[PDB]
Amino acid sequence: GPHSMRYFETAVSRPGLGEPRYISVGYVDDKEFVRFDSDAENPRYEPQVPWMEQEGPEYWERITQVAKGQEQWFRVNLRTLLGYYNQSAGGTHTLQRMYGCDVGSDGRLLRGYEQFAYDGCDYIALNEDLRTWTAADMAAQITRRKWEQAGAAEYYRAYLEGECVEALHRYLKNGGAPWNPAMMI
Amino acid sequence: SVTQPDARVTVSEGASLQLRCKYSYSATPYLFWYVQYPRQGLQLLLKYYSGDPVVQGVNGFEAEFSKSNSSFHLRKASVHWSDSAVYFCAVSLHRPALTFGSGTKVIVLPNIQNPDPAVYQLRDSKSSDKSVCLFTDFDSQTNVSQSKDSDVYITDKCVLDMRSMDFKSNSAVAWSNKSDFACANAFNSIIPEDTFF
Amino acid sequence: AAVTQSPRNKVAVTGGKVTLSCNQTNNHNNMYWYRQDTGHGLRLIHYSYGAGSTEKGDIPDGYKASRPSQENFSLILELATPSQTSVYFCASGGGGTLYFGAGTRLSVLEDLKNVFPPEVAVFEPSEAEISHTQKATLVCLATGFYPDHVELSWWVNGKEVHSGVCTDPQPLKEQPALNDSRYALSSRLRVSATFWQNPRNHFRCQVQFYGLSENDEWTQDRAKPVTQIVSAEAWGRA
């Protein structure tokens, strides 16, 4: 049958209480199989299922480093959205990124995802073509313009059609955001 | 991944310079061109992430980005002798850190005015018996082959510039303490027919 | 620049503890540690996102990193190996662009006794050359030094000169067969015949050698190969 991998990245700015809390959870099919927390005593990716504990320490070391880098990716874009909406830097705000892929019985890609939400409302999302974007408001339309100009959609498209399919096939044995300034919010 | 397929470039002065840089990415990455002049740190020439694919830089250097070719070539119409250095192409995309190419050393060969090939001999300022033989005033197209002997040492071609005198010249140094040190058997090294002795 | 490294020159020993330090004054959140080796260009060892942050680079094996503050990023070599012999660069990472330091040359040898300062000798211009070219070429020769942490400079009448100077980009293996081989370096200061023929003109080839620090214990009966300046001289004649 068909399968699905899905990651959820949430960053919540706590003004005066330190740098925003970063959390990343993963879902193979529809089971939470991995999880990262920045407020943990030893912040790293953790296996949330017994069948992921078989992975070597090299694997966990690699995927953790991405999250710690993604944590830096979100703190920067939180500053941007703070200015885009003309909000004060003394309030709490949340930036969310959802991505993953649906596959078929063949094993090939069926649908890729790349969605961004701010304060619980939709912002910008990758279309089914994996080439165009759908913006929610005017501020996101400003974001889409530079993303179509830089071709940020082709960054994720290689992931969704690539290792996202491959990593899903791997976990069934029973990545991050671009750092091009124009490809940012 | 980033590749500078040419490790070395030897060009005549005043000519054109093309430093090659290709990247292995599915999307447009943050591109950089750094220059490392002899015995110096790294200095930024230019960079690109969006907008005008043609980027201007200091010292008459311009780089053109081609998403189709997936390259960030660095070009210069008329290269000066001072541009003789090593150029690095950097890249950032997945991480906020720069991955570098293997670098390319450029060697500008000076427009030699009047080649006056000659091999002289110099004596120590302190001693006398010990000496060194100097090859100089030759054309830029000349290369240096060291004598196969183990105890006879030959340096590489070296260009000096008498600034304010409009005079650049090539030069090489040979020396040995062996029994028969003499600048007749010093330079098997392409030496010109019109070479003075 | 606003990025400084210490030390700039270090002679290490196999098995010793080496610590490179890099301070900044730019408030850049990111700091980097690279090493340069011919044929490989510039390779990443370790970097940091901020105070307390430590991230592995492309080739972290053998090295340890430390970010005690926003300004300081240090590289720690617990067990020094000859494979760690290279030129190291530090950087600050405000945004995407990088700002480098002057760099640090590190040599790790099997035995510290193989460290030698250079022998400097100035060779007077040839009279046949002066007669032909109306010019005079002096040649400085720095021989038998190890490792190649030398900086050559020409000094005419007290001032450092740069015009009419060319120095070999790399030293020579005196005994090319050996892994540990002393080096030889040559330089060329060329001036007018008249200027050389002025007997009240003083010429001096100055060679800067970087060797051992004071902390290293020396038991060799010969002078400790510390950082020093070896130089030869020559006067004008007629």
In sequence order, what DSSP letters do the residues of B123-177 get, joined into one string?
A: EESS-SS-EEEEEES--TT------S-SS-EE---EEEEETTTTEEEEEEEEE--
Query: What are residue B114's phi and psi, to 5 degrees?
Result: -130, 100
Q: Choose among A119, A38, A120: nearest CA to A81.
A: A119
Interface contact A179-C96, CB threshold 8 A:
yes
Window 200-219 of C: residues touching A by CB (8 A cutoff) are none
CA–CA distance, C21 with C65 (Å, rounded to integer): 10
Listed in sequence order, the residues at least 6 apart from C78 whose beta carbon sits closer than 8 Å to its beta carbon are C17, C64
In sequence order, the β-bridge partners of residue B31 are B48, B91
Which amino acid is it at B123? Answer: R
Interface contact B98-C98, CB threshold 8 A:
yes
| Eight-state DSSP code of residue C8 | S
Find, in chain B, the residue whose alpha carbon is nearest to that of A150: B50
Find, in chain B, the residue whose alpha carbon is nearest to that of C204: B125
CA–CA distance, A100 with C75 (Å, rounded to integer): 37
Percent of chain A as helix, strand, coil, to the nearest 5:
35, 30, 35
In sequence order, the β-bridge partners of residue B105 are B8, B86
Tokens (6 digits) for A125: 């999302």
Listed in sequence order, the residues at least 6 apart from A27 whose beta carbon sits closer than 8 Å to its beta carbon are A4, A5, A6, A7, A8, A33, A100
Find, in chain B, the residue whose alpha carbon is nearest to that of C234: B125
Which residue is it, tokens 């003309």?
A86
CA–CA distance, C229 with B177 (Å, rounded to integer): 25
With vertex at residue B25, the alpha carbon angle to CA B19 and CA B30, rounded to the nearest 5 degrees, is 65
CA–CA distance, A101 with A110 (Å, rounded to integer): 7
Q: How far is C82 from chain B (nearest CA, A)?
A: 21
- How far is Cα of residue C113 from the mean position of the Cα atoms in its chain? 19
E strand or H helix that includes residue A149: helix A138-150
Q: For residue B46, give the 3-state DSSP assignment.
A: strand
The radius of gyration of chain B's CA atoms, rounded to the nearest angstrom, is: 22
The CATH number of whichever domain residue A55 belongs to comes to: 3.30.500.10
Find, in chain C, the residue whose alpha carbon is nearest to that of A76: C95
A59: containing domain: 1-185
Listed in sequence order, the residues at least 6 apart from A70 whose beta carbon sits closer than 8 Å to its beta carbon are A9, A22, A24, A176, A177
Query: What are residue A53's phi and psi, to 5 degrees?
Result: -75, -15
Please state, as a whole number, how many other Cβ atoms lie within 10 Å of the Cβ of residue B27: 18
Tally of domains in chain A: 1
CA–CA distance, C166 with C185 (Å, rounded to integer): 11
Tell me the torsion sign for CA atoms A119, A123, A128, A130. Answer: negative
Q: Choose among B162, C56, C72, B123: nearest CA to C64.
A: C56
Using a CB–CB cutoff of 8 Å, tell me whether A150 touches chain B: yes
CA–CA distance, A130 with A156 (Å, rounded to integer): 8
Interface contact A180-B49, CB threshold 8 A:
yes
CA–CA distance, A67 with A62 (Å, rounded to integer): 9
Query: Which chain B residues are closer than 8 Å to A178 by Cβ?
Result: 27, 93-94
Listed in sequence order, the residues at least 6 apart from C179 whose beta carbon sits closer than 8 Å to its beta carbon are none
Interface contact B30-A176, CB threshold 8 A:
no
CATH number of the domain located at residue range(s) C1-110 in this protein:
2.60.40.10
CA–CA distance, B76 with B19 (Å, rounded to integer): 9
Percent of chain C as helix, strand, coil, to the nearest 5:
5, 50, 40
CA–CA distance, A123 with B10 (Å, rounded to integer): 53
Find, in chain A, the residue whose alpha carbon is nearest to that of C50: A72
Q: CB pairs below 8 Å between A and C: how many? A: 14
**Strand C55-56 relative to strand B118-124: parallel, antiparallel, unpaired?**
unpaired
Q: How far is C121 from chain B (nearest CA, A)?
A: 7
Percent of chain B as helix, strand, coil, to the nearest 5:
5, 45, 55
Helices A138-150, A57-84: crossing angle, 10 deg rounding: 130
Chains with 3 or more CB pairs under 8 A to chain A: B, C
Tokens (6 digits) for B48: 């690109």
Encode burial over A17-37: b for 16+ CB neighbours within 10 A, e otherwise. Answer: eeebbbbbbbbbeeeebbbbb
Chains with 3 or more CB pairs under 8 A to chain C: A, B
A130 close to A118: Cβ distance less than 8 angstroms: no
Which amino acid is it at C74? Answer: S
Q: For residue C223, give the 3-state DSSP assignment.
A: coil
Query: Which DSSP string corresponds to A40-91?
Result: SSS---EESSGGGTTS-HHHHHHHHHHHHHHHHHHHHHHHHHHHHTT--TTS
Q: Which of B26, B50, B94 lies nearest to residue A179, judging by beta carbons?
A: B94
- Cis bond leading into B29, ω under 30°? no
**Strand B54-56 relative to strand B62-66: parallel, antiparallel, unpaired?**
antiparallel
Q: CB pairs below 8 Å between A and B: how many? A: 47
Every domain of chain C with CATH number 2.60.40.10 lies at 1-110, 111-238
Query: Which chain C residues are closer than 8 Å to A71 by Cβ?
Result: 49
Using a CB–CB cutoff of 8 Å, tell me whether B150 touches chain A: no
CA–CA distance, C93 with C116 (Å, rounded to integer): 38
- Cis bond leading into C7, ω under 30°? yes
C115 close to C146: Cβ distance less than 8 angstroms: yes
CA–CA distance, B108 with B14 (Å, rounded to integer): 9
CATH number of the domain located at residue range(s) B111-196 in this protein:
2.60.40.10
| Eight-state DSSP code of residue B58 | G
Per-domain boundaries in chain B = 1-110, 111-196
In this chain, the answer to whether the domains covering B1-110 and B111-196 adopt an identical fold is yes
Tokens (6 digits) for B80: 């000066």
Q: Which of C29, C56, C96 lies nearest to residue A181, judging by beta carbons?
A: C96
CA–CA distance, A114 with A153 (Å, rounded to integer): 9
Mutate to test the interface with B, among C4, C92, C137, C152 (most CBs of B within 10 A): C137
Listed in sequence order, the residues at least 6 apart from C96 whose beta carbon sits closer than 8 Å to its beta carbon are A179, A181, B30, B47, B49, B92, B96
Q: For residue B4, give the 3-state DSSP assignment.
A: coil
A37 close to A43: Cβ distance less than 8 angstroms: yes
Q: Choose among A179, A11, A7, A183: nearest CA to A95.
A: A11
Which amino acid is it at A62? Answer: R
Mutate to test the interface with B, among C88, C98, C148, C189 (most CBs of B within 10 A): C98
Instruction: Give the CA distances from residue B61 to residues B55, B58, B87, C96, C97, in Å, rounded to whole numbers and listed in that order.
Output: 9, 6, 12, 21, 18
Entry resolution in angstroms? Answer: 2.9
In sequence order, the β-bridge partners of residue C189 are C138, C165
Tokens (6 digits) for B71: 């390259």
Count CA atoms within 13 Å of residue C154 on its CB side.
Answer: 23
Using a CB–CB cutoff of 8 Å, tell me whether A69 touches chain C: yes
B100 close to C41: Cβ distance less than 8 angstroms: yes
- For C111-238, the fitting CATH number among 2.60.40.10, 1.20.1250.20, 2.40.340.10, 2.60.120.860 is 2.60.40.10
List, comma-separated, the residues after which chain C is broken, a break being a C to N distance over 2.5 A; otherwise answer none. none
| Eight-state DSSP code of residue A146 | H
**CATH architecture type of domain B1-110:** Sandwich (2.60)
Exposed, middle or buried: residue A40 (CB in 10 Å: 0-12, 13-18, 19+)?
Answer: exposed
Tokens (6 digits) for C147: 């490792």
Query: Which DSSP string corresponds to A17-35?
Result: S-SPEEEEEEEETTEEEEE
